[PDB]
Design a protein around this nucleic acid. Structure first.
Ligand code: MG
Ligand code: MG
Ligand code: MG
Ligand code: MG
Ligand code: MG
Ligand code: MG
Ligand code: MG
Ligand code: MG
Ligand code: MG
Ligand code: MG
Ligand code: MG
Ligand code: MG
Ligand code: MG
Ligand code: MG
Ligand code: MG
Ligand code: MG
Ligand code: MG
Ligand code: MG
Ligand code: MG
Ligand code: MG
Ligand code: MG
Ligand code: MG
Ligand code: MG
Ligand code: MG
Ligand code: MG
Ligand code: MG
Ligand code: MG
Ligand code: MG
Ligand code: MG
Ligand code: MG
Ligand code: MG
Ligand code: MG
Ligand code: MG
Ligand code: MG
Ligand code: MG
Lengths: 102, 65, 89, 61
RNA sequence: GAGCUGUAAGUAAGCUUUGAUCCAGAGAUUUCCGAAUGGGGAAACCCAGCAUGAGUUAUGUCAUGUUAUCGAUAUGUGAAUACAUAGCAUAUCAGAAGGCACACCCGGAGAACUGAAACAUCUUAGUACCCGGAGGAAGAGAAAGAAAAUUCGAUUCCCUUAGUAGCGGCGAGCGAAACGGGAAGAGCCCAAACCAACAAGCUUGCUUGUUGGGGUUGUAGGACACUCUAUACGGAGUUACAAAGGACGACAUUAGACGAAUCAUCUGGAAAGAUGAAUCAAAGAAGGUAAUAAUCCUGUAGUCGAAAAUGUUGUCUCUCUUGAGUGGAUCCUGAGUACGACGGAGCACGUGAAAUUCCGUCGGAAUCUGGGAGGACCAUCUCCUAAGGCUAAAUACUCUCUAGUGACCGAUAGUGAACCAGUACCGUGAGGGAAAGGUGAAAAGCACCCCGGAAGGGGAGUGAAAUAGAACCUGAAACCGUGUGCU
RNA sequence: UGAGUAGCGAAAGACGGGUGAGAAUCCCGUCCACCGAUUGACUAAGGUUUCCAGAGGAAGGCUCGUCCGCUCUGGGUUAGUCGGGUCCUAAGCUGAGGCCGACAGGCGUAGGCGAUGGAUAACAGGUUGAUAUUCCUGUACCACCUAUAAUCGUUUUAAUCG
RNA sequence: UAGAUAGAAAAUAGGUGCCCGUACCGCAAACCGACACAGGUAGUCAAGAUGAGAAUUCUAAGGUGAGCGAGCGAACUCUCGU
């Protein structure tokens, strides 16, 4: 996917539209990603499980990768990504500024 | 153990390594049966090591012909 | 090939009583004979084998959900040692 | 599996026809005769048709 | 190029930027049964020989290789029976076997219901089934052709001729071909005469046989005799015309890479919708994304890309290879053949006036001043030159792979089978043969409390919705209940 | 719908004590009754895990169910001598060559296969929840192998094998 | 016997001896009968009293009380006694 673990992304669709956060996990086979503070779910945790304490646990749920957009390193605006070849190595380029993302 | 190390080993060393790996795998299987093996991935590791050793031995005895 | 003849030890109540009697129970390759079992045990555990009894166990029907099948057939040997001992643990 | 050893002459199929033109299957068999001829330079009793024997074209020995 | 150890969640233990998983080419491994092939056998099992090796004091035990049958080619031995012929023994062979794509092709054998308003000739039909043989196509094929002129010039296939000409208890029905227009096109090799070498009979006359050369036809050709032409100059070729290779190059297939352009607000759980204002387009195909997106993702147009294997091609190489004319003295030009009679069959053609073509049985030519055909037959004329062989393409079909298409189905439809289906189940067996899809955007799959043994439920919570809570979208009718206005 | 209807598949139970949320139906006890050339004990086919232990009660069980030939979890079958193979053959099957036959294939010789028959060395006792002529104890037998051997042989042999 | 070959072994001691089956039901609720079905299913053993007996009745060894019950004690049907 064009989004990668550790990237800083902006949510462009969903309840969290407009939020920014770090990509902390990707699910390539589902085309989904997990972004900090985005798409919080409240799951019912039984205290009877291997974890003694239980209740309602709040954690991020995966979001579809097409709902997050990379932020341009220069302008900090959401941008699509192209690829250049520098000394035979692929480099992700922001299509707004033209700068290497990483 | 990987194919490069196996290809540095000599034929006699390949055979001895196969013997020792088989003995190791056998002890691992016995520990697993008796319930004393927590690190179960060693079994697969050793099985694939044996497979690689036999691959390389066969390659050598093929290129000889 | 001895490590292939012997597959694993059998640990059950009857097998433990046998071990008290100096009889060790193993699952073995379904194709081998009593003599091969004896030689494999003697080579692996450096013991003297007094005798080997052997038996076959049919595949047993087993169910998991809506899927019907069978367990593997088994060949079980009981090796009575003449001299020495085997420590499985 | 009976045919002329020399020419391959064998039976064929056709019809017996009545005056009312009713049809029933029949065969025309070859006029095969068991004779001793030279096969691979050695005598051998084989089936040969009378026509293959005609005019002494097959040597009986 | 960052995750990964399948369905398949879980736990555990782990792997991985020193490049996992994953994708493509190549290779290694590949138990047992099965043609199954050491022998046997009620498939997936049992029991051996031989050689070599492991183990044991030794036996027992084990490992690897090999050992079926037939065929062919060699070697040895060799009965009745003398010579040697059965036979026997050994060695070699990528020799055969068996399967299937319920298709297409060729051949052997070959129904019946049915139609004829009955039924026997006839029809169904040379169909179904069975059997053998294939090939990627098969079959056919370079005139003993079609014809009747200004003749054409192998075969196959399409249109037409034409439901014509004919056939037919002249019933039911069956039903051409030539001409003309098209697709595709390609032509060759033997037998014989004759020459040379070799071997047998030993006229040791010159007869027979093998090999090579020569030769291939209707405008008659060839041998033979003579005259030119050349020793690969030229020409041809592994699709026939003889048959194996090699080098280099190109293209294609089997992974991939790059690939333009959108923001804001409103409603809403969510925007792609609406509104406003923009942008790309060789890209407005399509799918996905929390509703309907050219500009969010995967893509699309366009361009690029291969270590390796495979396929098709081009040039070199390689291999093979003479080509014409004149003459009419002699010679050759396919024999138990053509053909005839009887009995059958095939020809659209049912025996008919029945040519043309095949099978069985019996008889049986001619030899270029020859032989066959023009629908009995004869003459004339005209056209061909049988009784040997090969041959691509245009045609047929689809188990299969790749990319696509549909005024085709949308869960009683569409495959029998959207789902763990040729399953469950039924049958001794051949065989017959189902039912069964949908939570939600996300599992956020209901912590906790309460009644209850549990099941089940009431709250609470998640969620837009639980009135979406597990065959969980919607949820008709039959049918079953509770309450009630009028009766 | 028929309808809370027919039926619930040969029979003798009673009570006490347990267990349990729940008991005519499960466990234990006493008494009673039934078969007893047998409803008892083996065992060949056939079945194929139904066997044992622990747990369960949705469905199955013609009621109930705490129970079960059901569900879940884990177990259980031990052989030189028992039966079969490494022995034999009957009927039958198969069948190298072979004979016959449109094809397919049919028949058949040698030779194989093939028990329902022939041959063939182990018995008593003890033992588990579940195996026992199989495990254990005691005491045997059979085939074979190795070493030492009273004795006999030593190339027409003469001991020995056949 | 044809054949074979220096060597043979009464005894003593020691050792070796594979594969398949083996659970359980098996006149039955586990087999053939769609069923936890009054049917069918080869062979073996089979005590006492009585008796000719493997008949008869009652018992032994051993096993079993049968997978709906509780009442009532009409017609009628069935099985049985007078
Ligand atoms: Mg056994
Ligand atoms: Mg075999
Ligand atoms: Mg009719
Ligand atoms: Mg009619
Ligand atoms: Mg052809
Ligand atoms: Mg008439
Ligand atoms: Mg060629
Ligand atoms: Mg891209
Ligand atoms: Mg928007
Ligand atoms: Mg794009
Ligand atoms: Mg005729
Ligand atoms: Mg004529
Ligand atoms: Mg003629
Ligand atoms: Mg005419
Ligand atoms: Mg002419
Ligand atoms: Mg062709
Ligand atoms: Mg529907
Ligand atoms: Mg269907
Ligand atoms: Mg369906
Ligand atoms: Mg619904
Ligand atoms: Mg009532
Ligand atoms: Mg009534
Ligand atoms: Mg009534
Ligand atoms: Mg009633
Ligand atoms: Mg009852
Ligand atoms: Mg039980
Ligand atoms: Mg019930
Ligand atoms: Mg034969
Ligand atoms: Mg018997
Ligand atoms: Mg028992
Ligand atoms: Mg047993
Ligand atoms: Mg038993
Ligand atoms: Mg019945
Ligand atoms: Mg009987
Ligand atoms: Mg009696």
């Amino acid at each position: 996917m064009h989004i990668k673990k550790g990237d800083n992304v902006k949510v462009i669709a969903g309840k969290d539209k407009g939020k920014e956060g770090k990509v902390i996990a990707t699910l390539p086979k589902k085309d989904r990603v997990v972004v900090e503070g985005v798409n919080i779910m409240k799951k019912h945790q039984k205290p009877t499980q291997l974890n003694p304490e239980g209740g309602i646990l709040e954690t991020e749920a995966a979001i579809h990768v097409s709902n997050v957009q990379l932020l341009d390193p220069k302008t900090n605006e959401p941008t699509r990504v192209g690829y250049k070849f520098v000394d035979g190595k692929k480099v992700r380029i922001a299509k707004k500024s033209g700068e290497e993302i990483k | 153990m990987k194919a490069k190390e196996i290809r540095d080993l000599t034929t006699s060393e390949i055979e001895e390594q196969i013997k020792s790996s088989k003995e190791e795998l056998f002890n691992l299987r016995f520990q697993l049966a008796t319930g004393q093996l927590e690190e179960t991935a060693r079994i697969r590791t050793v099985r694939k090591t044996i497979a690689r050793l036999k691959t390389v031995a066969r390659e050598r005895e093929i290129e000889q012909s | 090939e001895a490590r292939d003849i012997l597959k694993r030890p059998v640990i059950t109540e009857k097998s433990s009583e046998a071990m008290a009697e100096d009889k060790y129970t193993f699952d073995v390759d379904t194709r081998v004979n009593k003599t091969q079992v004896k030689m494999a045990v003697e080579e692996i555990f450096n013991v003297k084998v007094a005798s080997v009894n052997i038996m076959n166990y049919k595949p047993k029907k087993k169910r998991m959900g809506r899927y019907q099948g069978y367990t593997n057939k088994r060949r079980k040997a009981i090796v009575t040692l003449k001299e020495g001992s085997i420590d499985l643990f | 599996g009976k045919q002329c050893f020399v020419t391959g002459r064998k039976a064929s199929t056709g019809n017996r026809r009545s005056h009312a033109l009713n049809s029933t299957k029949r065969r025309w068999n070859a006029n095969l005769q068991k004779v001793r001829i030279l096969v691979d330079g050695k005598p051998k009793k084989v089936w040969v048709s009378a026509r293959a024997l005609k005019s002494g074209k097959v040597t009986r020995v």
